[PDB]
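Box S1 | Example of a co-folding query
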Amino acid sequence: FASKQSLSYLDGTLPGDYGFDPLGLMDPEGAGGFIDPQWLPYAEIINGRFAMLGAAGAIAPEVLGRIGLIPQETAIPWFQSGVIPPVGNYSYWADPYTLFVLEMALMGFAEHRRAQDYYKPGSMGKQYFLGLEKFLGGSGNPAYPGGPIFNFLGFGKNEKELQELKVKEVKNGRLAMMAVLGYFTQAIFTGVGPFQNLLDHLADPVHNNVLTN
Amino acid sequence: SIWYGADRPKYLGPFSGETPSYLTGEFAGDYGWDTAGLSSDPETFARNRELEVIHARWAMLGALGCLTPELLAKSGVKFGEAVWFKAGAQIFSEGGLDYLGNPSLVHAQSILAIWASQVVLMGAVEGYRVAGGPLGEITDPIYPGGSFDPLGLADDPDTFAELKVKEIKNGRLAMFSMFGFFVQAIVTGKGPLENLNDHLADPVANNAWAYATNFVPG
Amino acid sequence: SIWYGADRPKYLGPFSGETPSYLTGEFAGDYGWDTAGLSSDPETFARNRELEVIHARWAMLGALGCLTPELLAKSGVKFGEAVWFKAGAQIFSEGGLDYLGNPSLVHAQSILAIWASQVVLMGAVEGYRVAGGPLGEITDPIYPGGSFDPLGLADDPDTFAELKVKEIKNGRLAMFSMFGFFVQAIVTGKGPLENLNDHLADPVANNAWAYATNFVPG
Ligand SMILES: CC(/C=C/C=C(C)/C=C/[C@@]12O[C@]1(C)C[C@@H](O)CC2(C)C)=C\C=C\C=C(C)\C=C\C=C(C)\C=C\[C@@]12O[C@]1(C)C[C@@H](O)CC2(C)C
Ligand SMILES: CC1=C[C@H](O)CC(C)(C)[C@H]1/C=C/C(C)=C/C=C/C(C)=C/C=C/C=C(C)/C=C/C=C(C)/C=C/C1=C(C)C[C@H](O)CC1(C)C
Ligand SMILES: CC1=C[C@H](O)CC(C)(C)[C@H]1/C=C/C(C)=C/C=C/C(C)=C/C=C/C=C(C)/C=C/C=C(C)/C=C/C1=C(C)C[C@H](O)CC1(C)C
Ligand SMILES: CCCCCCCCCCCCO[C@H]1O[C@H](CO)[C@@H](O[C@H]2O[C@H](CO)[C@@H](O)[C@H](O)[C@H]2O)[C@H](O)[C@H]1O
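Box S1 (continued) | Returned holo structure for LUT
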């Protein structure tokens, strides 16, 4: 499968398995220490999960301004929101450093609890806290945990449905990651937002190749 | 030892196919590429191997020496002349040929003295390379070792083979780079760094197609 | 037959002279012309066989593709550049690659994209040739057969041998014609059709040796 031939290191059993691994990083000779059988798929799916939100939010302000139901002051380019202050800045109620510290502290809490659960499955299920041990139950594998609050919808009744959903998720993650890489390339070449690039190929199909500059 | 084994990556990649009968490995940089069929004779094979390694070392030195002065001049170093194919004219300049533009260094003014010294010294060293001299005796034509490996980086035969592969690969890359340097210097007329800077901005028309019309008859 | 038996045409005719031992019969249209002994080694000789076959096929195709456009231009259909060595400006003209003068056909505008397209395609094609592929598995590099002889016109060994001999001789004719084309382009600077038209009118006046006066150095 997967264009170039496989080497049986993976048989397709893993969720979202395709076999397009020409180098084979999980080769046991080339695998060790940091490389862990559990860790690589987990890292891939997390980079993809955050790529979901990144790809969505790199266009959500611009498309919302286009349709006409968001304030026009939120039509700022995605790189001008404060991610790279040298390029530009966007208005806020507090300094970017303050919101940065807030978000780093909160992500520190969340990531720390998640990493403890990954390292020790009993984290936030038998630890000490104000009654959240019974509300953060560790179920199944760490990468696909679920829980009393995570399974509020209750979707995913059958294992065939689970594998279908998960292969869809990994495919969507791969396409989102390629989309986001294209986002940086367009930002560094044309200096504009990707939504404007859509406006251009829609307006001028033969507008430009690469940058011609 | 993937390279030396009977299964090696070859020059087509995974999809190689036919491999020459004699090319069973046992040599650095063996990619099974003998489409011309020139090294069928064993002694001819040894001679071609010697030519390859000597050319590779000379071309690595040449690429380094053709890039370094140009990079220094671009970076801000003062030179009498920095273009690799123009550096020979400094011996005919009034200011003379000074190393790093410093009149206190070399300060050579005559081409005949340089030519005579080069002929004598290179004749001596090539005679040593062919028959052995002050720095040792001939044991292997290409890999003498001893005084030319004073630090002993190739004592372990496995590491020796790995270093052979590394050296031959870097050398072949440098040879290809030197051929590129020659053709680009004769086509464009500017140094390799100028060509790279041209390709940096607007790569669409900064290529060979821009000059593809300079050699049309008429 | 005549080609394969001792009674061969040879390359000199009456002067058979000394003939190389390995180049005496049992080969496709051999004439005993090895005056420099390149292919003494059997491997080397085989490799020369495939090299000659491939150069011959490409020479045939190139000669046909150079002959057809100027003949069609003289026929009457509009051609921006029917000259074989002037086809480069087709992509350098604003109109583009108008196949048979039609902007509604092909009508390319860039060179990088098409060049990369072919580099990928022909790399895959040649790779399939050397190492087999989904199309078929090659039984001999020189003359695979099968898909490339779908009608099986050369099923009979005698007609196969005769057609192979004709292919080799026509490939050598294509060799010589392409060499003539190249020399005409470099020296005269015009297409072959203009050359033949000029040779028709006053053949003694229109001669190759009128262009030999300007090759003096200085
Ligand atoms: C996570 C990610 C993107 C996340 C983006 C986020 C969060 C963005 C957030 C914001 O932008 C918004 C929305 C707008 C503003 O608020 C600003 C910020 C705050 C900045 C991309 C991942 C991107 C990930 C990428 C590109 C991964 C590529 C991997 C490749 C190509 C691997 C290839 C191979 O590994 C195989 C498959 C097999 C091997 O055998 C061979 C090789 C070839 C090694
Ligand atoms: C493999 C094979 C196989 C089969 O057989 C087929 C075939 C094809 C036959 C083959 C192939 C081959 C090849 C590829 C080859 C190549 C070569 C080369 C490139 C060389 C170079 C080579 C190169 C070289 C030496 C170079 C050198 C250089 C030098 C010294 C330089 C010097 C200099 C400098 C510094 C600087 C100054 O200012 C100048 C000078 C003074 C000038
Ligand atoms: C045999 C022998 C024997 C004895 O011993 C002696 C000796 C010497 C050894 C030997 C000999 C040899 C010889 C003579 C050779 C020759 C060759 C040739 C001529 C080739 C060509 C060859 C040729 C060829 C391929 C060609 C090709 C081509 C192509 C692809 C293409 C083309 C084209 C076209 C279409 C179109 C465009 O627009 C242009 C062009 C681009 C142009
Ligand atoms: C103005 C001129 C003053 C004299 C300088 C020139 C003298 C002529 C040069 C003679 C060089 C002879 O060199 C030849 O014999 C030498 C021994 O004598 C060998 O040299 C060998 O023995 C020497 C001493 O015995 C050792 O210092 C060397 O390390 C060793 O390699 C060389 O391997 C050989 O190439």
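Residues 42-211 of chain C form a domain with the Chlorophyll a-b binding protein fold (CATH 1.10.3460.10). The helical segments of chain C are 42-75, 89-92, 112-131, 157-187, 192-200.
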